Amino acid sequence: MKELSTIQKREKLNTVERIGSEGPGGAYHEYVIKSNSMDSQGNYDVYETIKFQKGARKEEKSQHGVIDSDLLEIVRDRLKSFQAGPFSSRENACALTHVEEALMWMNRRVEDRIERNVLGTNTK
Amino acid sequence: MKELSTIQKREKLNTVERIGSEGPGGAYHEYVIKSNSMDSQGNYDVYETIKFQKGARKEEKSQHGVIDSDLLEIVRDRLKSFQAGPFSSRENACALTHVEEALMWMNRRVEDRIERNVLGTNTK
Amino acid sequence: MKELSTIQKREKLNTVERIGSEGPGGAYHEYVIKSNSMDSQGNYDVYETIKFQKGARKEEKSQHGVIDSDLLEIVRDRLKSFQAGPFSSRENACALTHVEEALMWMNRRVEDRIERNVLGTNTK
Amino acid sequence: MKELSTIQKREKLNTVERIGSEGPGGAYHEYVIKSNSMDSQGNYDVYETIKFQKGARKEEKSQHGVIDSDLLEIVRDRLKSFQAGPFSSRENACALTHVEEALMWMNRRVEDRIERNVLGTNTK
Amino acid sequence: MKELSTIQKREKLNTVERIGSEGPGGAYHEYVIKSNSMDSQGNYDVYETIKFQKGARKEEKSQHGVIDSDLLEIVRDRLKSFQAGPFSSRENACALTHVEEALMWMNRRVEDRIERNVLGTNTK
Amino acid sequence: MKELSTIQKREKLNTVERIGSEGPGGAYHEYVIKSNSMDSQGNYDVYETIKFQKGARKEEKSQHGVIDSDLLEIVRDRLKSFQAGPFSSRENACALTHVEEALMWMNRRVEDRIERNVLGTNTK
Ligand SMILES: Nc1nc(=O)c2ncn([C@@H]3O[C@@H]4COP(=O)(O)O[C@H]5[C@@H](O)[C@H](n6cnc7c(N)ncnc76)O[C@@H]5COP(=O)(O)O[C@@H]3[C@@H]4O)c2[nH]1
Ligand SMILES: Nc1nc(=O)c2ncn([C@@H]3O[C@@H]4COP(=O)(O)O[C@H]5[C@@H](O)[C@H](n6cnc7c(N)ncnc76)O[C@@H]5COP(=O)(O)O[C@@H]3[C@@H]4O)c2[nH]1
Ligand SMILES: Nc1nc(=O)c2ncn([C@@H]3O[C@@H]4COP(=O)(O)O[C@H]5[C@@H](O)[C@H](n6cnc7c(N)ncnc76)O[C@@H]5COP(=O)(O)O[C@@H]3[C@@H]4O)c2[nH]1
Ligand SMILES: Nc1nc(=O)c2ncn([C@@H]3O[C@@H]4COP(=O)(O)O[C@H]5[C@@H](O)[C@H](n6cnc7c(N)ncnc76)O[C@@H]5COP(=O)(O)O[C@@H]3[C@@H]4O)c2[nH]1
Ligand SMILES: Nc1nc(=O)c2ncn([C@@H]3O[C@@H]4COP(=O)(O)O[C@H]5[C@@H](O)[C@H](n6cnc7c(N)ncnc76)O[C@@H]5COP(=O)(O)O[C@@H]3[C@@H]4O)c2[nH]1
Ligand SMILES: Nc1nc(=O)c2ncn([C@@H]3O[C@@H]4COP(=O)(O)O[C@H]5[C@@H](O)[C@H](n6cnc7c(N)ncnc76)O[C@@H]5COP(=O)(O)O[C@@H]3[C@@H]4O)c2[nH]1
């Protein structure tokens, strides 16, 4: 189906699913994170929807939402916090460095698209 | 301020804020992503809350929520989609490799923790 | 020759040679590491053959042997040992991180091939 | 025990064990790779030993053996061959780049040591 | 135009400009660095030209000059100094690792071109 | 020794030399790059000085000059050109990616300092 195959294979808290159809650029713009667990009453402990910006912000017709950069900045902030606290680890430091370099490349993309004046249009 | 200082400085679609207080491990467990734009009535175009798992999933008193690798798996899937579509870029390729290596390091944490019998406990 | 061109060009303890013919996947499955030095009597100081698994382990026809992740795990263990000991270095630290990321990618390969039910088969 | 905890968790062909005790720098200098499979007589399908250089090469009393870059050069050559063949993969490319960068850092160590005149000597 | 589009966008000390014509390999071989500030007289605080080797050193007619690894070695030395000094930062440490790895890859290029017996020639 | 211990050891075209004294932050602010070869009168074929910014630009009293990121942007531009031309190489591609990531970390430093109000001051 549309349940994501993840790099983590054991002890997974949640599954992630694509919602809707492929949209601009070939990607999905809505996802659900839902728990692999249940309460005693049978509903999901976790059922969170994430909508991404689909179409440009400057247009009302567009689905306004989050961008990849926001999620990574959240994860970065939490990792910096965890490293400053009592349960730090070398794995956290390595993950954090990769998260920040991914963030830098995404920012490199936005800036390149500004220089070429293509930010916000459906063009390579 | 609780607004996060992000790597991206220009043309930001959204602002990210920590919500609540630092808790287990020294990290925040809820964040809000909100638009830098507003609608006619003056309401936000995007006002998205993300809640993270706080406390072990087995326990009912615990706040159940997402984990960081879910967010990165979403971003990873979207980057793979974009790279297969008409708007690919070398910047995407580098961001994607870093996102996957961050995911691989996070998995390494879970596996080390399983090996040491500390998964799900407040211990290094 | 079939001697391997190495990244280290100076003060090399040993030379490495490819042994045999290429086979499955375009690769060789036996190697010899021999010292660049001879003893008081003229015999080689070091002469190791390393045989790799050739064909699936589950088939009786196969040349059973080692796989690359085994060698890398040995090197990882030795580098971690050296870093915990009195002769640590930053060069060791950089090497160690790359060896671990190579292992993580080799394992990604294994997990992908299991997911697609192709592990142990001659299929891309 | 002396069994190494590896990054790979599923479908492991072999196990690696440390042999003996700590030597110079805090590392072990002999390892065994043995299959997780056995023949009819209960003998190992694979049992191979790798011995590392312990003590400087010139001193003749030293335990002469392989060095880590020899193993990494083998793995690098095999990965290059696989990438040229029909069973290539992106995981192979990422692993190969990391293996090569580990080799480049191992050479850098050697070159610094030659420069500081401390090669072959038990000195940081 | 002729001005380089740089990764740094705010508080830039200087501008970098391409000088002259496209040359061997498709690159430019003269660059100019000039301050974004000017003095009381209206003259530039900085106006520095860097010429690069265009053509082989052995031939007299060719423009003798610097090579890129020279510039990176200077930056590496300065970064090592700053890391030993009071104004170190994690950003400096990451930049330094990348500069050294870029240098090592430039050294791979030199070493390979030696081995294929093409160093100093206009050949792929 | 004010001469630089470089990563390339063979077939070097130029030598790089420290000029002047240790300065602010513990680093050198002038360097000379000189040809290993010779002009018939005996002057060096290449002899070029690069002076770095020492002290803040606004202060007239400072030594005005180039900054490290200027040199890396030149090298980046040359690497991108070479990769678009007939003499590309995989070594160039890796070198270029590392040069861009070093530049991004240097810009990450400038921004952090701006944020904390220390840019242009002698403080972390
Ligand atoms: N102002 C602003 N700041 C940003 O940081 C930013 N990041 C993305 N966007 C814009 O959001 C809108 C929603 O994206 P959509 O999926 O509809 O189209 C996207 C998507 O189909 C595709 N694409 C390819 N790679 C990526 C990528 N890495 N991130 C986002 N979109 C990508 O290429 C289209 C145009 O991208 P941008 O040209 O970045 O403009 C987008 C677009 O206007 C931004 N707008
Ligand atoms: N089954 C399962 N699979 C996972 O992948 C996973 N990841 C986290 N958890 C558990 O979720 C719960 C919520 O985390 P909390 O913040 O309360 O405590 C966490 C947090 O305070 C801190 N910590 C340090 N680094 C990290 C990190 N990278 N990710 C998460 N938590 C981290 O260290 C505590 C214990 O961590 P785990 O020992 O992984 O167990 C956690 C915990 O039981 C998981 N549980
Ligand atoms: N159980 C198990 N766990 C492992 O970790 C593992 N790693 C490899 N193998 C299997 O060993 C046997 C020996 O490899 P051979 O060279 O004949 O064929 C290999 C080889 O020709 C080629 N190949 C391509 N890339 C690689 C690679 N990175 N490592 C090994 N083989 C590779 O692709 C074939 C199939 O690979 P796998 O599909 O991984 O199955 C192999 C095969 O059955 C494993 N088997
Ligand atoms: N000629 C030559 N070329 C090489 O590439 C090379 N690599 C290692 N050696 C020498 O092999 C001998 C066996 O190592 P031992 O474990 O006894 O001591 C080692 C070991 O205890 C420790 N050490 C710390 N980090 C490393 C490391 N990365 N690799 C090897 N040894 C290391 O630090 C000691 C001295 O290292 P070198 O100073 O390189 O000399 C060694 C030593 O004489 C080499 N000799
Ligand atoms: N002795 C010596 N040691 C070095 O480290 C070195 N690095 C470069 N050179 C030689 O300098 C001269 C000036 O370069 P030019 O632009 O004219 O030609 C270059 C240039 O057009 C192109 N090229 C492609 N990638 C690169 C690259 N990464 N660095 C330099 N030149 C490159 O490919 C041509 C041949 O390169 P080399 O084959 O390395 O020989 C060069 C050449 O003789 C060197 N010479
Ligand atoms: N406007 C502006 N844009 C820039 O990109 C920039 N980069 C540097 N500078 C300023 O140039 C001046 C010359 O540097 P100096 O060596 O005297 O002091 C420097 C130097 O001694 C030390 N330092 C530590 N790490 C670095 C580094 N990576 N690059 C440069 N200097 C560094 O820390 C001091 C303060 O650095 P900044 O706080 O960036 O301010 C510098 C300084 O005012 C800049 N000014």
Tab-separated table of C-alpha atoms in Angstrom, chain E residues 20-96:
chain	number	residue	atom	x	y	z
E	20	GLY	CA	39.110	37.168	-18.362
E	21	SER	CA	38.026	34.250	-20.495
E	22	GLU	CA	36.916	30.664	-20.181
E	23	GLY	CA	39.920	28.370	-20.594
E	24	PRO	CA	41.343	24.836	-20.374
E	25	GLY	CA	38.861	22.410	-18.876
E	26	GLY	CA	36.116	25.032	-19.129
E	27	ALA	CA	37.226	27.125	-16.168
E	28	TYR	CA	38.387	30.658	-15.544
E	29	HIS	CA	41.950	31.223	-14.394
E	30	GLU	CA	41.835	34.715	-12.905
E	31	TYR	CA	39.621	35.985	-10.114
E	32	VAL	CA	39.353	39.241	-8.231
E	33	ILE	CA	38.394	39.925	-4.614
E	34	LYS	CA	37.232	43.474	-3.867
E	35	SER	CA	35.737	44.909	-0.696
E	36	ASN	CA	32.094	45.913	-0.447
E	37	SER	CA	33.402	48.861	1.410
E	38	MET	CA	35.384	51.803	0.161
E	39	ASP	CA	37.503	54.427	1.903
E	40	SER	CA	37.280	58.161	2.513
E	41	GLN	CA	38.682	58.875	-0.886
E	42	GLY	CA	36.276	56.432	-2.516
E	43	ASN	CA	38.917	53.897	-3.240
E	44	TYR	CA	38.531	50.211	-2.544
E	45	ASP	CA	39.718	48.841	0.740
E	46	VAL	CA	40.506	45.554	-1.005
E	47	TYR	CA	41.220	44.862	-4.667
E	48	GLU	CA	43.206	41.571	-4.960
E	49	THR	CA	43.783	39.441	-8.003
E	50	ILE	CA	44.487	35.667	-7.951
E	51	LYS	CA	45.845	33.995	-11.056
E	52	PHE	CA	45.782	30.338	-11.553
E	53	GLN	CA	48.055	28.053	-13.392
E	54	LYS	CA	46.735	27.832	-16.850
E	55	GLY	CA	48.814	25.347	-18.739
E	56	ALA	CA	51.636	23.177	-17.520
E	57	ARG	CA	54.254	24.483	-15.217
E	58	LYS	CA	57.011	23.020	-17.317
E	59	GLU	CA	56.010	25.066	-20.380
E	60	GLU	CA	57.182	28.668	-20.111
E	61	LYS	CA	54.457	30.167	-22.156
E	62	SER	CA	51.738	28.998	-19.833
E	63	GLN	CA	50.524	31.282	-17.024
E	64	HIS	CA	52.122	30.156	-13.985
E	65	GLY	CA	50.019	30.343	-10.916
E	66	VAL	CA	48.332	28.957	-7.911
E	67	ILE	CA	46.373	25.760	-7.667
E	68	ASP	CA	43.225	25.252	-5.666
E	69	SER	CA	44.771	22.998	-3.028
E	70	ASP	CA	47.053	25.939	-2.099
E	71	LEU	CA	44.051	28.088	-1.226
E	72	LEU	CA	42.463	25.228	0.722
E	73	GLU	CA	45.701	24.543	2.615
E	74	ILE	CA	45.847	28.189	3.667
E	75	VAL	CA	42.255	28.043	4.904
E	76	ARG	CA	42.965	24.756	6.703
E	77	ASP	CA	45.957	26.257	8.499
E	78	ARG	CA	43.915	29.286	9.544
E	79	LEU	CA	41.058	27.069	10.728
E	80	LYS	CA	43.409	24.866	12.785
E	81	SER	CA	44.855	28.021	14.370
E	82	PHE	CA	41.386	29.359	15.247
E	83	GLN	CA	40.440	25.986	16.731
E	84	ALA	CA	43.470	26.077	19.008
E	85	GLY	CA	42.735	29.695	19.917
E	86	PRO	CA	40.052	31.218	22.127
E	87	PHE	CA	37.499	31.754	19.351
E	88	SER	CA	36.873	28.176	18.370
E	89	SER	CA	33.396	26.971	17.446
E	90	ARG	CA	31.700	23.800	16.313
E	91	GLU	CA	31.129	25.562	12.969
E	92	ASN	CA	34.902	25.957	12.581
E	93	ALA	CA	35.394	22.276	13.404
E	94	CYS	CA	32.897	21.141	10.753
E	95	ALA	CA	34.289	23.533	8.145
E	96	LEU	CA	37.784	22.238	8.908
